[PDB]
Design a binder for these strands. Sequence first.
DNA 1: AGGCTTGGTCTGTTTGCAGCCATCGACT
DNA 2: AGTCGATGTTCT
RNA 3: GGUGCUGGCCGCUCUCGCUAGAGGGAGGUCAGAGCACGCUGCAAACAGACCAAGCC
Length: 861
Amino acid sequence: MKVHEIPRSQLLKIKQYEGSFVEWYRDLQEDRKKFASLLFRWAAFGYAAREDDGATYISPSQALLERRLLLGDAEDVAIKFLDVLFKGGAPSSSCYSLFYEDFALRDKAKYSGAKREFIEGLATMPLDKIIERIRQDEQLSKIPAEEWLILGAEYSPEEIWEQVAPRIVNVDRSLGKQLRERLGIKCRRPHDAGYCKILMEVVARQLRSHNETYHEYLNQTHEMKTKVANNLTNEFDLVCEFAEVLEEKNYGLGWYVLWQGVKQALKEQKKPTKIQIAVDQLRQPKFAGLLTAKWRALKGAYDTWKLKKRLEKRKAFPYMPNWDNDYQIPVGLTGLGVFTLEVKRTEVVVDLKEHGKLFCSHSHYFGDLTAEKHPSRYHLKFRHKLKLRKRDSRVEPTIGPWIEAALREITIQKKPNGVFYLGLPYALSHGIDNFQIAKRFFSAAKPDKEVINGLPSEMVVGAADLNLSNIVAPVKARIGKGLEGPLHALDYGYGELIDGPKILTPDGPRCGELISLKRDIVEIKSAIKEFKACQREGLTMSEETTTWLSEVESPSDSPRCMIQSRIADTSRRLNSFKYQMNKEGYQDLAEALRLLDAMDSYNSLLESYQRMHLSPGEQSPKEAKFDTKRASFRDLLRRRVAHTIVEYFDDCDIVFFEDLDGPSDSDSRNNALVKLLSPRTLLLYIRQALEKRGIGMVEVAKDGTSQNNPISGHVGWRNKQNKSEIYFYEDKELLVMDADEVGAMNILCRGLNHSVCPYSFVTKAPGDYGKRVKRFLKDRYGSSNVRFLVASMGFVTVTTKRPKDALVGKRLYYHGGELVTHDLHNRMKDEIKYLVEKEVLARRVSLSDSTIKSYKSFAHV
DNA sequence: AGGCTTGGTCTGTTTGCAGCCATCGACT
DNA sequence: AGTCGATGTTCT
RNA sequence: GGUGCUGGCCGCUCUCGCUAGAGGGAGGUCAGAGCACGCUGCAAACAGACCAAGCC
Ligand SMILES: [Mg+2]
């Protein structure tokens, strides 16, 4: 079967070093360091020079100046050298040649494997297959197919090679040797192939990381000045004229500031609102051409101004990369540096043959590690144990499973504390089938039919919905060609469900009073300004905030110190529950979550008590205390969300998730999840722990997955006071279920639909739809080039003719099979919204039921 | 008391570049 | 047999 | 048995202060383990947090 390896690495703290290495490391982080800032100029990279006063703005012409002013003669070769260096990969086979002083060349090109296969079948190979092999080969075109053909007919295969190798050689490999002598280039060590071979690719490994950014950072400047001057309307002609006369008067302009300006200026309103400076400038004649603008044609003139102002804050070219910080030095078995390795008294040892031996410590991640050398790879076998602090604890150390893997190179780094670490970039022999199916089959709209036939009969899926509430609600399922069932999967068949959907981490107990503890910090932020706003006016304080302050046993009624006792009593609460949760190791994520935010508002509060005394206009330059906690903690919770999500998804082959970082609706900027814990870092941290077990992961859209009904597709209402419940109107009977459960089904639904079944899209006139939108209109109604008609009851119809009466350039919603419009999707929400308000009784419907024959959401048949 | 816009200073958050080497030929 | 230098590819 | 994460106590220092106290910060010190673990360099865009004004 086909396998695919997965790159991972975990630390190893080095204790002692032996030999001349210490100088050796310091030389590479000085040889790298030394020449990287010189090679910067050779490709003429336009660079800002970092400075406290600003950033100087050097241009390519101001940098191409010193290219020939630094190399008068190597220029005509260096440009050929940089390309054969920027291509990289390995066909640049020996770029190290310039550093190595004894660099020898051979007069023959090497006998490559693909260079052998081409000669023995030179007699019969067709020219419409001979020329498609060589055209794409760097060494083969240099001889035209004429003299290629003659040797195949006359000569037996083995004789031909003896006379073509000095002809098809890649003459770029000499470019390195010339530059050293013509430039007087000396490194620190020069007969040492290791020192050279590593350093060449190492500096290159840091440089190519800058070239592709360079042409990509630029190609944005070419796409940004295209999409600012493509939407210049007579509405842009006066929208930016609004901010010019706003900054002179010392003001600015926002987004939701926009809609209450014309509604108060279209009826004589003599009592201003928060935007009177706009309303008084929305009564002048030069901005009276703005009050009369349309509905949607102004959202497409707000983004350009919100896009143009990003063109002006952006620098014209990248900064200069700072190279002083130590880089992760890699050393590999074959070709690069040479190393051997052992486990000495369960303590790791590393040996480098020319330059002496490192020393190493016993590690917990590799708990029962073993090593056996094979000629190309190291084979490791180990498991994960726990970390053993207590000696007479009844507590067994958690045993991980054994891991069979391969390892071929090692990494080294100094940390700012002066410690040398050692890394192990290891590869995992795992089945590629799950990944192979993941990208090609579920991600995309239509896979080729030779790919669809790459499926076994039955396989397992999963999904969940994650919001800040009770985070994980999974559902496992079974999909089958043979087996019939209630969920429709595109191109694979029907499926029937094993477990789920259930919530797995319900919000723990201590949360209820920790939010109640957050409110205690909520009032301290608004109250500290009351001590600071009456210091400027001369007034006293409000009793309602004062009455709250007295709730503490405070030995002084002074307003100042009672503030401090509500906070010391608050810090103790955080200090205490810190301890009693540290006992556990944080086994309830849902608990630590509302605690994490509680740890946030406390640190967010101490920055206003240090700045209480400050008279108006003098600040405190709060410095980095390199709080190591808040950074390396909120990571731990994410790498702990894996364990609860992996445990329930081990037996699955594929997983699905809600990608909350995509084109979402408007309420997702203030949302805490983009603020509290990264979606993609969490989804990727799941992927990294899912890839580890050879289980594919494929995201799907985030557009209204919580909203739709899994059974009937009809709309629902996420209760605006209780986000955990959601309501539905079907069959003249009201129903209710759990929202963050509902989302798990709609993600499982949309997953088996390849995200094809849409939620909302924008019309045009038969500006094209994406390839994932097409397969819906073609499969159901008949084609892609279709206009849409408003019809009886205010529905929408798909017409196979293309008339001009119809609505074009608008927006829709999809429910149960019917294409409905926007003024109806409000009405449809309005249908449930009113029934709940009138205090009617609904019927809860679990989705674990068997009475359901088929789920009709995101399926078309 | 609260509700935005502007800017500065400081960390913190979310991304796409580079990478995780095999094989012959000369020589022991 | 074995070491270490120097050399080899191409689709999205 | 490598990196994380935690509270008391001690002083030390720092900041304010209706005088009551609080809050930091790198280390010296008393307590707790059913806690997961892709390491790393260059780069770029937002948002988050506090002091200032004008404005309704
Ligand atoms: Mg949700």
